[PDB]
């Protein structure tokens, strides 16, 4: 790069780079922290957040609302396949559950 | 008054000693009964070596007690 702008803007990363570096340094993870690790980690975090936010926004739009709420977040996480596996242990507050009724319990013809 | 004294050889003997007797009086009685010289003798009771300058009255010794005798070999 040109070594002119701020590090967060230098790498085109919305998430901060200095804060990640400080957290890695003072998090008791290793005696040394490389100069390239925080950029990579911030990029990964931003990409994950972007994916989750895109799915949640789609779910909210399909519900005729313009404000993301935890129910939409739970719908977005559960309906996907990869994000369901990644977050298979967490419990979203006020997230509800997916709608499903077992095929057996449905009324007979 | 009967009192038990036991040497380093494991022998215990009985001697009549009134409470008012001094330690040197007990040593003289020991000389009277066997005659083992008192210079090599040291008397032990209650973790304290008996001193001839104090009478047994102030030592607070009851009846049927047992004293220890240690011989100090002069030479070697």
């Amino acid at each position: 790069s040109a070594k002119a702008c701020t590090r967060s803007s230098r790498a085109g990363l919305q998430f901060p780079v200095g804060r990640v570096h400080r957290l890695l340094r003072k998090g008791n993870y290793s005696e040394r922290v490389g100069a390239g690790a925080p950029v990579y980690l911030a990029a990964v975090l931003e990409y994950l957040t972007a994916e989750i936010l895109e799915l949640a926004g789609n779910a909210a739009r399909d519900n005729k609302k313009t404000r993301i709420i935890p129910r939409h977040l739970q719908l977005a996480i559960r309906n996907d396949e990869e994000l369901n596996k990644l977050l298979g242990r967490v419990t979203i507050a006020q997230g509800g559950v997916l709608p499903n009724i077992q095929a057996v319990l449905l009324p007979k013809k | 008054m009967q009192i038990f004294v036991k040497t380093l050889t494991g022998k215990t003997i009985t001697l009549e000693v009134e409470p008012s007797d001094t330690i040197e009086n007990v040593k003289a009685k020991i000389q009277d009964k066997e005659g083992i010289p008192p210079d090599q003798q040291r008397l032990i009771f209650a973790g304290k070596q008996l001193e001839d300058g104090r009478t047994l009255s102030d030592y607070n010794i009851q009846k049927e007690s047992t004293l220890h005798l240690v011989l100090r070999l002069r030479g070697g």
Binding site: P70, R89, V90, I92, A93, I101 | -
Partner: protein, 83 residues
């Protein structure tokens, strides 16, 4: 100021509603006692660790961070309360 028999405060309609959210159509009559026992055991497990966490820090009021840390320790991560 002690309390007694508060586990009966988890009334039968509440368990019915929880099951209906779970996806249950027909509920037997002996489910409620078993569910109350299970809930009591889970509460004991979480509260023990939360109280230990708040006792180590020499505090007197258990806080949300303590509860979420106990839940994370047991393997049930909780989002929406900090940390």
């Amino acid at each position: 100021k002690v309390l007694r028999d508060n586990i009966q405060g988890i009334t039968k309609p509440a368990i019915r509603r929880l099951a209906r959210r779970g996806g249950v159509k027909r509920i037997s009559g002996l489910i409620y006692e078993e569910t109350r026992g299970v809930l009591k055991v889970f509460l004991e497990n979480v509260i023990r660790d939360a109280v230990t966490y708040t006792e180590h820090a020499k505090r007197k009021t258990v806080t949300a961070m303590d509860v979420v840390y106990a839940l994370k320790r047991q393997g049930r991560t909780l989002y929406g309360f900090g940390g």
